[PDB]
Amino acid sequence: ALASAQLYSAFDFNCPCLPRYNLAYGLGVLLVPPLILFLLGFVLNNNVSMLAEEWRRPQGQRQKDAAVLRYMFCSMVQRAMIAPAVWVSVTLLDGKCITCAFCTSLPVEALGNASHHGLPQGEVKRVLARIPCKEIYDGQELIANEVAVRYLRCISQALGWCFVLLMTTLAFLVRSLRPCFTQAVFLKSRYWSHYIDIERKLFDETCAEHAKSFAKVCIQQFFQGMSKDLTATH
Amino acid sequence: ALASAQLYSAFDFNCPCLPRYNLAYGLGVLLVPPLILFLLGFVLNNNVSMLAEEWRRPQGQRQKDAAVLRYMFCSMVQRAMIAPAVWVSVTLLDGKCITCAFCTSLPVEALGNASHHGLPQGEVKRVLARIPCKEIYDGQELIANEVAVRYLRCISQALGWCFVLLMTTLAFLVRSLRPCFTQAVFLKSRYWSHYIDIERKLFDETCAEHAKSFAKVCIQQFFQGMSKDLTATH
Amino acid sequence: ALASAQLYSAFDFNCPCLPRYNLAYGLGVLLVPPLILFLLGFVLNNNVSMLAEEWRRPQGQRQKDAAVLRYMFCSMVQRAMIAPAVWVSVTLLDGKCITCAFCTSLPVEALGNASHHGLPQGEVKRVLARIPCKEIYDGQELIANEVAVRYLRCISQALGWCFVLLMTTLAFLVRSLRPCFTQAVFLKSRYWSHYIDIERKLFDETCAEHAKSFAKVCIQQFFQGMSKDLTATH
Amino acid sequence: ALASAQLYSAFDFNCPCLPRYNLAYGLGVLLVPPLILFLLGFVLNNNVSMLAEEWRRPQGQRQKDAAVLRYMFCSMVQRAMIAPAVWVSVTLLDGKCITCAFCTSLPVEALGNASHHGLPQGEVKRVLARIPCKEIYDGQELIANEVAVRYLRCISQALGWCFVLLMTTLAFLVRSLRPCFTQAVFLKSRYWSHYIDIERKLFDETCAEHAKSFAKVCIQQFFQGMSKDLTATH
Amino acid sequence: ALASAQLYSAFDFNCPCLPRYNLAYGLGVLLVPPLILFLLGFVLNNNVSMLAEEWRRPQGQRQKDAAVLRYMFCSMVQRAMIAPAVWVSVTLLDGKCITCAFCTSLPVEALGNASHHGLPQGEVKRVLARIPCKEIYDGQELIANEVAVRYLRCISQALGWCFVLLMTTLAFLVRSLRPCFTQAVFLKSRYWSHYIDIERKLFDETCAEHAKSFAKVCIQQFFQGMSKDLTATH
Amino acid sequence: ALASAQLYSAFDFNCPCLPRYNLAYGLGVLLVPPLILFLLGFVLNNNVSMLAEEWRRPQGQRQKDAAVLRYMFCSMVQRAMIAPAVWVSVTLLDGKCITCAFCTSLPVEALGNASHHGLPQGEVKRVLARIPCKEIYDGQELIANEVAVRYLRCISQALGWCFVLLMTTLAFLVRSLRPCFTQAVFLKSRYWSHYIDIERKLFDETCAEHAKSFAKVCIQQFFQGMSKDLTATH
Amino acid sequence: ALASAQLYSAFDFNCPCLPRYNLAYGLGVLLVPPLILFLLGFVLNNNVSMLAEEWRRPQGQRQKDAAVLRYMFCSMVQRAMIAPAVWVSVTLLDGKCITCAFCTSLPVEALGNASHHGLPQGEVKRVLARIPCKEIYDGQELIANEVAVRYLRCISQALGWCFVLLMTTLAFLVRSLRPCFTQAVFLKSRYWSHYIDIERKLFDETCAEHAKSFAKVCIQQFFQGMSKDLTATH
Amino acid sequence: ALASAQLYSAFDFNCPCLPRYNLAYGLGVLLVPPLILFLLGFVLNNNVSMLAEEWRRPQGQRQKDAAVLRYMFCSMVQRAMIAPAVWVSVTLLDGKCITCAFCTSLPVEALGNASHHGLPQGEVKRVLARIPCKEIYDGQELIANEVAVRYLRCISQALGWCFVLLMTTLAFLVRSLRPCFTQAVFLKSRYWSHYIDIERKLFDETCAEHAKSFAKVCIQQFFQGMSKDLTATH
Ligand SMILES: CCCCCCCC/C=C\CCCCCCCC(=O)O[C@@H](COC(=O)CCCCCCCCCCCCCCC)COP(=O)([O-])OCC[N+](C)(C)C
Ligand SMILES: CCCCCCCC/C=C\CCCCCCCC(=O)O[C@@H](COC(=O)CCCCCCCCCCCCCCC)COP(=O)([O-])OCC[N+](C)(C)C
Ligand SMILES: CCCCCCCC/C=C\CCCCCCCC(=O)O[C@@H](COC(=O)CCCCCCCCCCCCCCC)COP(=O)([O-])OCC[N+](C)(C)C
C-alpha cells in the first residue's frame, strides 16, 4: 500500500501537448496503473489457487462448500481494493494527471481572456492544448498560463477530497453491516485456514525425518572405502 | 493523530483567485478533511461491529444491556474527536486556509488605502479576490498586498489559539466529571472486553489442535505409496 | 516539557503593524499558550478524577482525609507549573513576542532621533507601530529601524534572565521547606497510590480468569455441530 | 531483483548521434543486459548441476523421474524471469533507451515543422539523428528539439505500462492454473529437496567426528618430545 | 554540565550599543547565568532536604552528628561548582560577552588612530560604544573596526586560559588534600546514604504487600453481584 | 569484490596528452590493477601454503594425492577470477580508461571534419592526442571535442557489455559441467578441510591445558615470600 | 586523548597583529593548554590521594614501601604525558600557532623582496607584524603576503614531524627497557590495586546488609498506627 | 592500518616554492611518516619487552631458545611493514608529494615550450620551482602550468602501481615459502604465547582471592566502634 504512493515520485509525468493525444495519455496514467495493482493484489495472495482449483469444475461436486467459497472470494476482493484506491486519490490531489486531460476543453470566454481575438475554431484546440509544459505556449493572448493552471489544478482537488469521502464512507458501511458477515459461515473460513497451514508444517517434518532414517545407509559407502586409513599420519 | 499534522505538508494548498469560488474552496479544505478523519476513527476501531449487530434490532431484546451500550458508544466517539481536532487547529495556525476564504470581504477604507480610487462596486470583488497568489495582483493601488496578508493571517491565529483553548477546556471538563462515568456501569464494559479477547485466542487453539489430530490420517496416503523405496540409493 | 520549546519553532510569529492591535496580539501570544499548557497539565494526570469525585460532595463525609487531599492537590499543581514556566521564559529570550508589544511606547527623543521633525502626536503611533516587519517602514527619519530593535530586543532578555532567576529561586525555596511536606501526611499519600495501582492490576486478573472458565461451554457448540467430519479427507 | 533497478543509475546512458549506429546502440542497451540477468539467474541457483548431471545422459536410465525433472526445470525458469522483466520495464519508463533508438524514423511533416525546407532525403537522417544530446543540434528549423523529445518520450511510456500489464496478467494466469502444477508430481519435488539438504548437513557431522577420533594420535607426538620440561620454571 | 555549553548556542547575544548600558548588559550575561546554574545544582540533588530539616533547629539536638553535616554540606557545594565553572570559561573564550563590556574604555591614542581628530571628550563614549554591531559605526576615522575587535577579542582569551588554569589548579589541590577528607568521618557519610536508600525500597515493598492482602475483600463485592450469570451464553 | 568497485572512485584518472605515452598509460590502468587483485586473491586464502609445501617436492612421494591437489588448485584459481573480472568490466563502462588509449587512432575523415585542412601527417597525432582533458585542445577545426568523445565513449561500452556477456556465459558453463567436478574426488577435498580445522582447534586446547597445570608451581614462589603479612593492617 | 584534538576546532585562533604581543599570544596558546591537560591528567586518576596521604609524612614510617611508591608515581606520570603530547604536535601541524609567533623575525632580504625600499628599522616590525590576518596588510611592497605564509607555515610542519619522531622514539625506548620495570617491585603494585578495589566493594555489602537488619524496626511504627484499618473499604 | 589512509586527509600538504627546499620538504613528507608508523608498530605490540629482556644479556644463557627468538622477531617485523607500506603507496597515487619534489628537474625543451626564450641557467630553477601553488607563477611563457602538472602527476602514479605490484608480489612470495616457517619451531612459539596469557589471568585470580580473605579482619574495626547503635531510631 505504501509502495503505491512512493512509486509515484519515481514516475516522471509529462504530457505530450497534442490535440487528441492528451485525453488518451492523461486517463491512461489514471486508470491503467490501478488495474495493475488490482491484479497484483491477487498473485501476492496465497488462497488464489484454491479458488481456481475449486471453481474450475463446473459440475457442482465442489469440496469445501457452496457458501464458504462466496465468502472467501468476496473477502479477498476487499483487501485488493486498498492499493488502487490509494493510487487514484493521491494522483488526483496533484492535477498533473488531470490538468492535461481536459485542458483542451475548458471555457476561455468565462474566466480567461475575451471570447475571440482573431483565431478560428480549429486552432483553439491547437493552442489551448499546450497549456501544461510552460516553455512553449503560443497563447499568452488567449489566456494566461498562470491562471488556467489554477482553474484546473483546483477542480482536480475537488474530485480528490470528494473521492476520498465516498471511499471512506463505503469502507465504514461495509465494515459494520451485512455483506456475507454471518457468524456461522465465518467459522468455516477461519477453520479451513489453520488446516491449510499446519498441513504444510506437519508434512515437512515427516519427509525430512524419513530421509534422515534413509540417508545414513548411503554415507557408509563413501566412508570405509577411501583407504580406511589416513596416509598423513605421523 | 500524528499523521494528521504531517499529511498537511504533503497537501499543496493553492486558492483559485475567483470571486465566488474562494469561499467554497476555502471552507472545503477546512471542514471536509476533518469529516474524513472522523469516519476513519470508527473503521479503525474494532467494537464498531458489536454496536451495529446489537443496535440493528429495533425490538428491545438486546443482549448486553440498555446502559452499557450507551457508555461504550459515548466512549468511542470521544477517542475519535482527537484526530479532527488536531486538523482544524493546526490548519488555523497558518492562515492559508483562511486567508483566501474571507479575502473578498475585508474593509479597505479602514486599514488599507483610501475609500475609493475610481472603481465600481463590482470589480472590488474582482480585484480584492486575487490577494493571495502574489504573482498576478492588479490592486496595488487599492491596498498593499504585503499589508492585507498581515491583517488576515493575524486574525486566523486568534481563532487558532481561541479554538485550542475552548477545546482543552472541554477535555479537562469531561475528563473529571459526570458524563456516564459511573462506577457500576464501568465494570461491565471493562469486563465484556476481556470476554471478547480471550474468546478469539481460545478458539484458535482448539481449532488448530483439532486439525493436527485429523491431518495425520491424510499424510499417510501420499507416503508409502510413491514407491516405498528410493531409487537413488547406491 | 521539551515539547514546549520545540513547538515554538513550528509557530510562525508575525505582528500586525497596527496601532492598537499590537498590544493585544503581543500579550496573547505570551499568556494564552501558557494557559493551555496549565490545563493540559491536569488532563494528562490520572489522579484528577479522584479529587472531583471526592471534592464534589459539599457535605464533609469525604473518604480519604481532610488533610491528605490538600497535600495531593498542592502537589499536582506544582508538577504543572513546569510546562508554562518554560514557555514564558524561552519566549522572553527572543524579543519578537515583546518587541511588537511595546514598540508603540518607547521614547524617541531619548535614544532615537530628535524630539520632533514635523509630525503630529497621532501619526507617531501610526509610524512607530510598524517597527517590526522590516519591509514597510515609513519612519527612517524619526528613528533607525536597526537601532530601535536593539533597544527593545535587549530589554526583553533582561526580563528573561530576571524571570528565570526568580523562578529557580522559588523552586529552591519550596523544594527544601514547609509547604505541606510533613512526614506523617506524606506516608498516607504514598500509600493510597499503591492501593489504586494494584487494584486495577488485580481486578483484570480475576475477570479474565472468570471468562476462560466460562467461554469453554460456548465453543463446544460451534464445534461438533458443523458436520463432525471433514469432507476433504482422502 | 532490487539490484536490477539501482544499477541503472550507475550506468550512464549516452547515445552516439550517428545515422546507423543509433538503432544498434539503442536496442543493445535494451536487450543485452536482460540476457545477462537471465543466465545469471541460473548460476545463483543450486539445483542447476543436478539437471546437467541428469540431463547429460541421452540414454533414458535417468534416476529421479521422467516427469519430476520437467517440473523442476519449468519451475526454475520462472524464478529467473523476474530479474529481466524488471529491467525491460523500468528502462522503458524513461525513453532514453528508446528516444535515440527510433529518433531517425519519426515523421516531421505530421507533428513537427513543414514537410520540406530545402534539404535532400539523405541529410534528414543526418540531421534528425542528433535529436538527443541537446548541445549540437543543427535542425532547429526542421523540428524543435523540445517537442520532438516529448513525442518520443511519451510513446515509450505507452509501451512501458502496456508491457507491465501484459506481464502481470501472465503471472496472474500461470500462478493459478495448469502448467505442471499437479498435486502428485509436486510432492516428489518438495521431497527430493530435503534429501539433498540433510545429506550435506549429515555428512559434515560424520567426517568431522571421524577426524577428532584420529587427530589425537598425532598431537601426542609433538608434545612429550620437545623437552618434557619447561626451562623457564623458577 | 554538557548542557551548559550547548545552551550558549541557543542564546543569541547582541549588545545594545549605548554608553552606560553596555557595562550592565555585558556583565549580566557573564554572572547571572552562572548564578542560575549554582542554585540549580542544589534542587537537582536529593540530600538538600535533610540539611534544611536538620539545620533548621537552632537548638543543638541535631540527630546525625555535629561533624558529618559539615562534610556532607562541603561535599555538595563542590559538585555544584562544575556547572558555573564551565559557563564562565567557555563564554570568556569568545569575547562577545567581553568585547562590548569594556569597549567604551580602551585607549585610542595607543594602538588605534591619532590621539585627537576633532571630537570632544563626551562623544568618544558616544562613538566608541558602537564598536560591536558592525553595521552602524560612525567612528571609522577614530579607530578601525577591524583592529579594535582584535585587541579586545584577544584580551578575553587571555583571561580565558588564565581562568581555566587557576580553576584546574584548585581542583587538583582540593582533590588530594585536607579539606574535611578524614577517614573516620567519611565512613559515617557513606553509611547514612545506604540507610536512606534501602529505606525507601523496603518501605514500598511492605505497603504494596499490605494492600494486596486487603484489596481482595473488595473485589468480591463487584463480582458475584452483577447477575452471577452471563446472558450472552448460547 | 565490492572493494574493487569503490576503490575506483578513490583513484583519480587523468591521461597525459602526449603522442606515445597515452597507449602506455591507458592500458596500464586497465591491466595492472587486475594483476594486483589476482595475486592478492591467493595471499588472502589459507590453503596456499599446503600447495607450496606439497608441490615443492619434485619427487612424487606427495602425501595428499595425485588428483586431489589438481582439484584444490583449480578450485582456488576460480574464486580469484571474480575480483579482476569486476575491475576490467566496470572500468570499461566508463571510457576514460579507453577514451585516451586509442584517441590517437580514430579516423577523422569518416565521422569528424573534412579529410585535410592544412596539417602534415605528424601533427595529427600531435593534435588528436589531446582529445581528453578538455581545457587545452588546439584541434577544434579538425574535429569537435564534444563529438569525438561520444564516438569513443560509446565503443567502450560495447566492449563493456560484450565482455560481461562472455564472462557470465563462462561461469554458467563451468558451474554446471565437467571441469574436475567428479563425485569421488570431491569428498576427499571436503574431508581434508575439516581435518585441518579441528586440528588447530584441538591443539590449542591441549597446550593451554598443559600450561595451567604447570604455571601454578611458579606463582607459589612470588607469593608467601613477599612478607607473608600485610603491614597496612589496622 | 581524542578530546584534545577535537577541542582545537572549537577554539577560534586569531593573532593580534601587534609588535610585541604576538610572541606572547603565540607561545601562550602553545604551552598553556598543555599545562592544563597535564594537571588534568592527575585529578582524573584515582591513586593521586594515596601518594599525598603517604608522601605527606616527612618522617619515613611510610606504610606501603620505599620503592613501590617511586614506581607508582613514575607510572602515573607516563600516562599523563599522552594528552599534552597530542596537543603540542597537532597544533604544530597547522602553523597558525607558529605563523604569528615568529612572523616579526624572518628575513626579508633573503626570500622576500629587496633589502630596503625606504622604511626605517622600526616600522619593519610595525609592518611585518601584520602578516597573518590577510585583510589589513600595508606591506605588499616589502614582501608578498602569499609567499611569507608559505615560508613559515612550512617551517612549522618540519618541527611537527621532527617532534612526533622524537616523541615516538622515546615511547619505544622506555616501553622496552629499565626505568623501574623490575619484576619483583611490579607484583607489589599490581597486588595493592586489587586490595583497594575489593575493599570498597566488600565494605558496601556489609553496610547495606547492616541497615536492612535495622530499618525494619522503624517501619513497624508508621504502620499499625495510622488507623489499623482502611476506611475506603466497601 | 586504516588510520594510515584517513590521516592523510587531515594533513594539509603545501610545498614551499623555493629552489633547494622542495627536494627536502618533498621527500620528508614521503619517508618520515613511514618511519613513525614503523616504530609505532612495535610499541603497540606486547612481546617487545620479552625480546629486550632476553636479547639484553650478551652471554648466551638465554632462556627461551636460540631459534625461537629469531622466529618471533622475524614475525613481528612483518606485521609492522603493513602500515608504512600503505602510506608510501597512497601518497604516491596523488603526485602532490612528488609533483613538487622533482618539479625543478624536468626537461622543458622536450615536452614544454621552446629550449630558450631569454633567461639564464640560474633563474630556470628560480622559475620552474614555483610550478605547484598555481597562484604565483611567473613562467607561463617557459611552460604551461596546466601541462607540466600532467607530466609529473602521471609519472607518480606509474611508481604508484609499480610499487604496489612489487609489494604484493613480495607478500605472496614470503606467505608461501621458507623464511623461518618450519613446523617444529612454529609449535614452540605458539605454545609460549598461551603460557604468557593464562599466567596473567591465573595470577589475578589468586591475588584478589588472597585479599578478600584478609580485608575482612579490617572492616570489623570501623564497624562495632562507631556507636554500636543508631541514634536516628524512632
Ligand atoms: C527500489 C526498488 C525499485 C522497485 C521497482 C519499482 C518499479 C516496478 C515496475 C514494474 C514492476 C513489474 C513487475 C512484473 C511482474 C513481476 C512478477 C513476474 O513477472 O513473475 C512472472 C514472470 O514470469 C513470466 O511468466 C513472464 C514471462 C513473459 C516473457 C517476457 C519476456 C522477458 C524478456 C525480455 C524480452 C523483451 C522483448 C520485447 C520488447 C518489448 C511469473 O513468475 P513467478 O515465479 O510465478 O512470479 C511470482 C511473482 N511474485 C513474486 C509476485 C509472487
Ligand atoms: C557497490 C557494489 C558494486 C556492484 C557492481 C555492479 C556492476 C557489476 C558489473 C558486472 C558484473 C560482472 C560479473 C562477472 C560474473 C561474476 C562471476 C564470475 O565471474 O565467476 C567466474 C569467474 O571465473 C571464470 O571462469 C572466468 C575466467 C575468464 C578469464 C577472464 C580474464 C580476466 C583477466 C582480465 C584480462 C582482460 C584482457 C582482455 C581485455 C578485453 C567463475 O568462477 P566461480 O567461482 O564459479 O563464480 C561463482 C559465481 N557466483 C559467485 C555468482 C556464484
Ligand atoms: C578506508 C581504507 C582505505 C583503503 C586503502 C585503499 C588503497 C590500497 C592501496 C594499496 C594497497 C597495498 C597493500 C600492500 C600489500 C599489503 C600486505 C603486505 O604488504 O604484507 C607484507 C608486508 O611485508 C613485506 O614483506 C614487504 C617488505 C618490503 C619492504 C618495503 C619498504 C617499505 C618502507 C618504505 C621505504 C620506501 C623507499 C622507496 C620509495 C620508492 C608481508 O607481511 P605479512 O604479515 O605476511 O602480510 C599479510 C598480508 N595480509 C594481511 C593480506 C594477509
Side-chain angles (χ1 to χ4, degrees), chain A residues 23 33-34 37-38 46 52 90 97 101 124 127-128 131 163 170 173 195 197 203 208 215:
Chain A
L23 184 41
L37 287 145
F38 193 91
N46 279 313
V90 61
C97 170
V124 292
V127 59
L128 279 160
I131 278 174
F163 182 87
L170 196 62
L173 189 63
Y195 190 100
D197 211 47
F203 170 79

Side-chain angles (χ1 to χ4, degrees), chain F residues 7 10 36 40 43-44, chain H residues 1-6 30-31 34 38 75 77-86 88-90 92-93 159 161 163-164 166-168 170-172 174-175:
Chain F
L7 207 170
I36 298 309
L40 206 75
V43 309
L44 269 292
Chain H
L2 311 93
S4 69
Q6 281 306 111
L30 190 63
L31 310 191
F38 193 91
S75 177
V77 171
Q78 295 184 356
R79 307 198 62 72
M81 290 292 175
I82 290 171
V86 172
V88 187
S89 86
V90 61
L92 271 192
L93 297 181
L159 305 183
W161 291 122
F163 182 87
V164 189
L166 175 141
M167 188 61 70
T168 311
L170 196 62
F172 163 78
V174 49
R175 188 70 190 279

Side-chain angles (χ1 to χ4, degrees), chain E residues 28-55 57-58 60-64 66-106:
Chain E
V29 170
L30 190 63
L31 310 191
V32 170
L35 185 42
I36 298 309
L37 287 145
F38 193 91
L39 298 172
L40 206 75
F42 277 48
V43 309
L44 269 292
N45 197 328
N46 279 313
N47 304 147
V48 62
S49 81
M50 169 178 319
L51 276 295
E53 173 172 47
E54 177 56 281
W55 198 78
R57 316 180 181 84
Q61 81 289 24
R62 301 163 182 168
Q63 303 303 71
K64 303 280 289 294
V68 188
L69 293 180
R70 292 178 39 182
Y71 171 74
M72 207 180 301
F73 174 52
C74 203
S75 177
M76 186 165 48
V77 171
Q78 295 184 356
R79 307 198 62 72
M81 290 292 175
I82 290 171
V86 172
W87 178 273
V88 187
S89 86
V90 61
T91 188
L92 271 192
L93 297 181
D94 286 5
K96 299 203 305 303
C97 170
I98 193 78
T99 182
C100 87
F102 301 92
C103 52
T104 185
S105 180
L106 64 87

Side-chain angles (χ1 to χ4, degrees), chain A residues 28-55 57-58 60-64 66-70:
Chain A
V29 170
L30 190 63
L31 310 191
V32 170
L35 185 42
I36 298 309
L37 287 145
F38 193 91
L39 298 172
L40 206 75
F42 277 48
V43 309
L44 269 292
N45 197 328
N46 279 313
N47 304 147
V48 62
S49 81
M50 169 178 319
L51 276 295
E53 173 172 47
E54 177 56 281
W55 198 78
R57 316 180 181 84
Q61 81 289 24
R62 301 163 181 168
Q63 303 303 71
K64 303 280 289 294
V68 188
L69 293 180
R70 292 178 39 182

Side-chain angles (χ1 to χ4, degrees), chain D residues 123-133 136-137 139 142-164:
Chain D
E123 279 77 341
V124 292
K125 326 293 290 299
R126 304 289 317 279
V127 59
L128 279 160
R130 288 183 286 273
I131 278 174
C133 172
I136 50 169
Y137 175 30
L142 191 60
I143 176 172
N145 168 82
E146 273 152 342
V147 164
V149 173
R150 288 295 182 73
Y151 203 118
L152 294 166
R153 182 171 172 81
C154 162
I155 297 296
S156 176
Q157 322 204 355
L159 305 183
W161 291 122
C162 179
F163 182 87
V164 189

Side-chain angles (χ1 to χ4, degrees), chain B residues 93-94 146-147 150-151 153-155 157-158 161-162 164-166 168-169 171-173 175-177 181 183 187 190-191 194-195 198-199 202-204 206-208 210 214 217-218 221, chain C residues 11-12 14-18 21 25 29 32-33 35-36 39-40 42-46 48-49 52 87 133 136 203-204 207-208 210-212 215-216 218-220 223 229-230 233:
Chain B
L93 297 181
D94 286 5
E146 272 152 343
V147 164
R150 288 295 182 73
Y151 203 118
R153 182 171 172 81
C154 162
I155 297 296
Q157 322 204 355
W161 291 122
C162 179
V164 189
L165 181 42
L166 175 141
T168 311
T169 184
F172 163 78
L173 189 63
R175 188 70 190 279
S176 88
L177 272 190
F181 197 37
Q183 186 65 40
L187 310 192
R190 167 60 85 89
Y191 164 55
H194 287 271
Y195 190 100
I198 76 164
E199 191 71 347
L202 186 139
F203 170 79
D204 288 16
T206 289
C207 67
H210 196 299
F214 212 103
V217 61
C218 179
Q221 308 317 117
Chain C
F11 193 92
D12 205 18
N14 46 354
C15 205
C17 297
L18 272 299
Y21 291 168
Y25 177 70
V29 170
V32 170
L35 185 42
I36 298 309
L39 298 172
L40 206 75
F42 277 48
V43 309
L44 269 292
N45 197 328
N46 279 313
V48 62
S49 81
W87 178 273
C133 172
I136 50 169
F203 170 79
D204 288 16
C207 67
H210 196 299
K212 172 189 311 299
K216 185 265 171 192
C218 179
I219 202 167
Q220 293 323 93
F223 274 26
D229 162 83
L230 310 91
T233 183

